[PDB]
Write a protein that binds this ligand. Structure first.
Ligand code: NA
Length: 181
């Protein structure tokens, strides 16, 4: 429909911890925007099943965060593996953005990309090698004019779709607040 090699793929993952070699992906969500950050379509929001032995690696932060959000219950009830989650997400993305064109977009998105390289390389390969990291702009704004940052706030629920929507909203805020293009 609005298929374009200028469209942006936004992605957020939730994990059982910070180490891709030890931990697992338990949620993924994607959004496609056009190049002007208008949201065109939201992709599959997938709680990925993991056995208790993997959930049992979670520290207190992860356990309390992902239990209180309802994600742990959704993970336990899920019948979707990483491979099926890749299949669903690729089938969505192919309708909106060509392979290899969009940088990976999000907040500190290098961390998600590490988990994609390790656990979902077929999905990682769909992105261009570059990164659109909204937190790059956050950090530059904090140093150049930190008063700007008091004008925007995040809920930070660690529900993957809500958090990637907040990533887009943050960049929209920066477009008006710190950019002149
Ligand atoms: Na994130």
């Amino acid at each position: 429909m609005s298929f374009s090699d200028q469209n942006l793929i936004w992605i957020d993952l939730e994990m059982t911890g910070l180490d891709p070699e030890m931990h697992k992906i338990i949620e993924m969500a994607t959004i496609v925007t056009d190049s002007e950050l208008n949201i065109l379509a939201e992709g599959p929001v997938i709680a990925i099943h993991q056995p208790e032995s993997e959930l049992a690696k979670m520290d207190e932060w992860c356990t309390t965060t992902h239990t209180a959000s309802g994600l742990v219950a959704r993970v336990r009830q899920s019948q979707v593996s990483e491979e099926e989650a890749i299949d669903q997400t690729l089938a969505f993305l192919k309708q909106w953005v060509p392979e290899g064109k969009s940088p990976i977009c999000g907040n500190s998105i290098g961390q998600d990309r590490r988990f994609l390289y390790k656990h979902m390389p077929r999905l990682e390969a769909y992105f261009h090698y570059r990164y659109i990291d909204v937190s790059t702009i956050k950090e530059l704004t904090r140093r150049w004019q930190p008063e700007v940052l008091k004008e925007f706030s995040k809920t930070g629920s660690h529900l993957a779709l809500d958090d990637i929507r907040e990533s887009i909203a943050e960049l929209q805020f920066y477009r008006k607040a710190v950019f002149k293009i």
